[PDB]
Amino acid sequence: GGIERVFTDKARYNPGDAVSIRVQAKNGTGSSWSGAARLEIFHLENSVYTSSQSLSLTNGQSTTLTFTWTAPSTDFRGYFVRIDAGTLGQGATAIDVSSDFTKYPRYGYISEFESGETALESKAKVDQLAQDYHINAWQFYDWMWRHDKMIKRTGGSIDSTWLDLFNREISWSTLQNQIDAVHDVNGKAMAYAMIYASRENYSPLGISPTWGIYEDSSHTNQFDVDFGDGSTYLYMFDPQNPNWQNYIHAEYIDSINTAGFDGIHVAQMGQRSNVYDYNGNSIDLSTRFSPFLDQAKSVLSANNPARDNLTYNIVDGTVNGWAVNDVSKNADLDFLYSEIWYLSDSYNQLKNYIEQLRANGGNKAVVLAAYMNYADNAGTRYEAESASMTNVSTNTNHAGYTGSGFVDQFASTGDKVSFAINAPEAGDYSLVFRYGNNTGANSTLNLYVDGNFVQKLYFFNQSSWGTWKHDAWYQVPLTQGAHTVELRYESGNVGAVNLDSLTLGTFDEHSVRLADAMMSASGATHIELGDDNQMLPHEYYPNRSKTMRSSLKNAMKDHYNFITAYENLLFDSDVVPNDTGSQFVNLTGVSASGDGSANTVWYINKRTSDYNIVHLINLLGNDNQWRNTASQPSFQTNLPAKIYIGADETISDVYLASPDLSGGETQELAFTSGTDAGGKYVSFTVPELKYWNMIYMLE
């Protein structure tokens, strides 16, 4: 249909605020049209509001309706929004009423701060994320000048621009425009800062090496982070040291009061061991973040209670992981955040780590960084040996290449490889080259798109000609249809590469839908969206080596509506596991599992004071890894389910909501309860399972 968009002005509302629901419509049906748009808002199974407006439209013409509504008085509630326009079509969105984003955070990011970005454009990228996904907080990533001197001043004046550690130009006015825009959607701005990093040559800033942490007991090698140009490093300091606290806390305060941030997103480099202080005592670094964090929270709350938000990145998250118990149990954080690497690879493992962080933290919110399809060179592939190459030829003499071979000796002026690609729809494309380089140095090549120079791309030296990487990419705007993408070796380029393929880097809808379901069904959200509708492909946020296509965009809008509409059932302080032995689940005709086994329908049991909640995630046709790409699941329809309950509980009604079905609208189901040789039960037909169903049953 032609209900093109439904969204609200703001990403979160306080009780009593005025909410402006917008419906964008275009009659596409051939002739003129006369009917109504009927608005209905639910809190879970209940209708709390209904309203209707007349609408008529000459074929082709568009309009935007506004329905007003007043956020009800109960704080911390989520709502589903339906708009039904009869034969024009329907649409949906969702609304979050919370006076504090820290209970139901929907965390995005901003990582680009160019001088050329107008106030209007800053506002647009922000509105888009607020409107489509209800993003209520933004992590400002790599905005600071130095990790130990965050705002660059000349005497007493703020410098209008400054260069960051990777040489990017950061504009003050742009950062401020973006912070303003975040604030205009009732968003909050969290500033990225390390817990313990200076930059090189820190002495003249009055930072003392006595505050540092060392790899020896003789204070000769301070832990660093080498960015590999003989010049740019981080150095690491002791969280517990009072003079480092004093120094860096002061920089956090400076950033709140000068930039107008609402909090600090505190980061770290993850596990280090056999760590010493300056003098030489050996110390367990794992236990030392919480006293820093507690003290940081204290000066931030004293400085300004409204701009004192605080989280800390727990790196390498897993059950009983490094620093996992101490930080989640003892650190005065508003919400928990954890970047996942390789110690929770299965849906069920990460599911358990999330549960640990919910239980340790006292059921305060949990956000995961968990870069989807990280290792995968996912998307449509144009093999390099099936392209048009000038002065270079194919070969097969280094293993692991894809297809029938790869292009080699791409190594001198005049060499060329031109790909004939097709863009299935207008938009941004991630042009990703898989390559080899063992020249012992960076190899370059110039990139041309439809005959116009776009960028000189670097190809990184690897260990061995048999080590394929695919981290040479550039993102570009493309019109639907044919295009030409050409690497030329010209005069100014250096080195040499073998070239395996070009890929239109694309997040895989299927994996992405399934991981988000798993995450939120478990009790967590996912920092995955930012800047101008980008999805996060790597720890360095300005990476655009993969793009979303339109189909996944729509799925993400459904998902983010669903986790806002149903947040009381997903993340409330009284949502807990209910997997305590008394509850099996039966599904007729398909394999089911409670531990998220490959090729099954996974059921997860959670409960609250009033509802028995069973999630189904559909792993049929797919493996049990959360991060990797995946095929469409085996969709199911009219699927008999049987839920064994507690011997005591009594089910009034059975409800099923799914982001995959009607935008997340709750549909009530008919169910018969009896009892049999192997438990007391209830039973019903599940109309459909695609990726994720949430069954909530009211007792």
Ligand X SMILES: OC[C@H]1O[C@H](OC[C@H]2O[C@H](OC[C@H]3O[C@H](OC[C@H]4O[C@H](OC[C@H]5O[C@H](OC[C@H]6O[C@H](OC[C@H]7O[C@H](OC[C@H]8O[C@@H](O)[C@H](O)[C@@H](O)[C@@H]8O)[C@H](O)[C@@H](O)[C@@H]7O)[C@H](O)[C@@H](O)[C@@H]6O)[C@H](O)[C@@H](O)[C@@H]5O)[C@H](O)[C@@H](O)[C@@H]4O)[C@H](O)[C@@H](O)[C@@H]3O)[C@H](O)[C@@H](O)[C@@H]2O)[C@H](O)[C@@H](O)[C@@H]1O
Ligand Y SMILES: OC[C@H]1O[C@H](OC[C@H]2O[C@H](OC[C@H]3O[C@H](OC[C@H]4O[C@H](O)[C@H](O)[C@@H](O)[C@@H]4O)[C@H](O)[C@@H](O)[C@@H]3O)[C@H](O)[C@@H](O)[C@@H]2O)[C@H](O)[C@@H](O)[C@@H]1O
Positions in the binding site for ligand X (CB under 6 A): 142, 166-167, 194, 227-229, 267-268, 313, 315, 339, 369, 442, 455, 457-458, 460, 471-474, 538-540, 543, 545
Residue 394 found at the interface with Ca ion (CB under 5 A): no
Residues that bind ligand Y (CB under 6 A): 398, 408-409, 411, 439, 465, 495-496, 498
Binding segment (CB under 5 A) for Ca ion, from list 141-149, 387-395, 398-406, 574-582: 398-406
The listed partner (Na ion, Ca ion, ligand X, none) that binds 500, CB under 5 to 8 Å by sort, is Ca ion
Q: Which residue lies nearer to ligand X by CB, 457 or 535?
A: 457
Residue in this structure with the two tokens 């009790």, named with its chain if needed: 523
The listed partner (ligand Y, Na ion, Ca ion, none) that binds 383, CB under 5 to 8 Å by sort, is Ca ion
Q: Which residue lies nearer to Na ion by CB, 438 or 628?
A: 628
Q: Is 455 exposed, middle or buried (0-12, 13-18, 19+ CB in 10 A)?
A: middle
Residue 668 and residue 666: Cα distance in Å, rounded? Answer: 7
Residue 269 and residue 323: Cα distance in Å, rounded? Answer: 12
Please give the order of strands across the beta sheet that includes 197-199. Answer: 197-199, 233-236, 224-226
CB of 629: closest distance to Na ion in angstroms?
A: 7
Q: Which residues pair with 593 in a beta bridge?
A: 602
For CA atoms 246, 337, 506, 126, the dihedral sign is: negative
The values of phi and psi at residue 300, to 5°, are: -65, -40
Q: Which residue lies nearer to ligand Y by CB, 251 or 408?
A: 408
The listed partner (ligand X, ligand Y, Ca ion, none) that binds 229, CB under 5 to 8 Å by sort, is ligand X
Residue 591 and residue 669: Cα distance in Å, rounded? Answer: 22
500, 508, 509, 528: which one contacts Ca ion (CB under 5 A)? 500
Q: What's the half-sphere exposure (Cβ side, CA atoms, 13 Å) at 588?
A: 10
Q: Which residue lies nearer to ligand X by CB, 471 or 579?
A: 471
Residue 466 found at the interface with Ca ion (CB under 5 A): no
Residue 408 found at the interface with Ca ion (CB under 5 A): no
3-class SS string, 579-621: CCCCCCEEECCCCEECCCCCCCEEEEEEECCCEEEEEEEECCC
The listed partner (Na ion, ligand X, Ca ion, none) that binds 630, CB under 5 to 8 Å by sort, is Na ion
Beta strands in 258-362 (DSSP E): 263-267, 275-276, 282-283, 309-315, 336-339
Q: Is the distance from CB of 539 to CB of 69 less than 8 angstroms? A: no
322, 406, 655, 691: which one contacts Ca ion (CB under 5 A)? 406
Q: Which residue lies nearer to Ca ion by CB, 402 or 673?
A: 402
Residue 384 and residue 388: Cα distance in Å, rounded? Answer: 8
Residue 278 and residue 269: Cα distance in Å, rounded? Answer: 19
Q: Is 215 exposed, middle or buried (0-12, 13-18, 19+ CB in 10 A)?
A: middle
CB of 412: closest distance to ligand Y in angstroms?
A: 7
CB of 267: closest distance to ligand X in angstroms?
A: 3
The listed partner (Na ion, Ca ion, ligand X, none) that binds 102, CB under 5 to 8 Å by sort, is none
CB of 373: closest distance to ligand X in angstroms?
A: 13
Task: Give kind and range of the element (H or E) at residue 145.
Answer: none
Q: Is the distance from CB of 609 to CB of 574 less than 8 angstroms? A: yes
The listed partner (ligand X, Na ion, ligand Y, none) that binds 623, CB under 5 to 8 Å by sort, is Na ion
Q: What's the half-sphere exposure (Cβ side, CA atoms, 13 Å) at 189?
A: 25
Report the relative pairing of strands 592-593 and 601-607 from DSSP bridges: parallel
Residue 386 and residue 383: Cα distance in Å, rounded? Answer: 5
The listed partner (Ca ion, Na ion, ligand Y, none) that binds 625, CB under 5 to 8 Å by sort, is Na ion
Q: Which residue lies nearer to Ca ion by CB, 80 or 401?
A: 401
CB of 142: closest distance to ligand X in angstroms?
A: 5
CB of 96: closest distance to ligand X in angstroms?
A: 26
The listed partner (ligand X, Ca ion, Na ion, none) that binds 605, CB under 5 to 8 Å by sort, is none
Q: Is 186 helix (H, G, I), strand (E, B) or coil?
A: coil
Q: Is the distance from CB of 534 to CB of 544 less than 8 angstroms? A: yes
Residue 630 found at the interface with Na ion (CB under 5 A): yes
Residue 173 found at the interface with Na ion (CB under 5 A): no
Closest to 471 (Cα-Cα) out of 431, 510, 441, 438 = 431
The listed partner (Ca ion, Na ion, ligand Y, none) that binds 352, CB under 5 to 8 Å by sort, is none
Residue 479 and residue 350: Cα distance in Å, rounded? Answer: 39
The values of phi and psi at residue 349, to 5°, are: -75, -50
CB of 122: closest distance to ligand X in angstroms?
A: 21
The listed partner (ligand Y, ligand X, Ca ion, none) that binds 408, CB under 5 to 8 Å by sort, is ligand Y
Residue 473 gets which letter from DSSP? E
2, 361, 403, 679: which one contacts Ca ion (CB under 5 A)? 403
Residue 528 found at the interface with Ca ion (CB under 5 A): no
Q: Which residue lies nearer to Ca ion by CB, 252 or 419?
A: 419
The contact mask relative to Na ion for 596-625 (x = CB under 5 A, - = no) is ---------------------------x-x
Closest to 315 (Cα-Cα) out of 194, 165, 492 = 194
Q: Which residues pair with 194 in a beta bridge?
A: 267
Chain centroid to Cα 451, Å, comes to 35
The listed partner (ligand Y, Na ion, ligand X, none) that binds 411, CB under 5 to 8 Å by sort, is ligand Y
Cα dihedral 655, 661, 663, 667, rounded to 10, equals -20
Q: Which residues pair with 433 in a beta bridge?
A: 472, 502
CB of 266: closest distance to ligand X in angstroms?
A: 9
The listed partner (ligand Y, Na ion, ligand X, none) that binds 460, CB under 5 to 8 Å by sort, is ligand X
The listed partner (ligand X, Ca ion, Na ion, none) that binds 406, CB under 5 to 8 Å by sort, is Ca ion
Q: How many residues does the chain have?
A: 699
339, 383, 528, 531: which one contacts Ca ion (CB under 5 A)? 383
Q: Which residue lies nearer to ligand X by CB, 80 or 371?
A: 371
CB of 314: closest distance to ligand X in angstroms?
A: 9
CB of 236: closest distance to ligand X in angstroms?
A: 11
CB of 415: closest distance to ligand Y in angstroms?
A: 10
Contact residues toward Na ion (CB under 5 A) are 623, 625, 628, 630
Contact residues toward Ca ion (CB under 5 A) are 383, 401-403, 406, 500-501
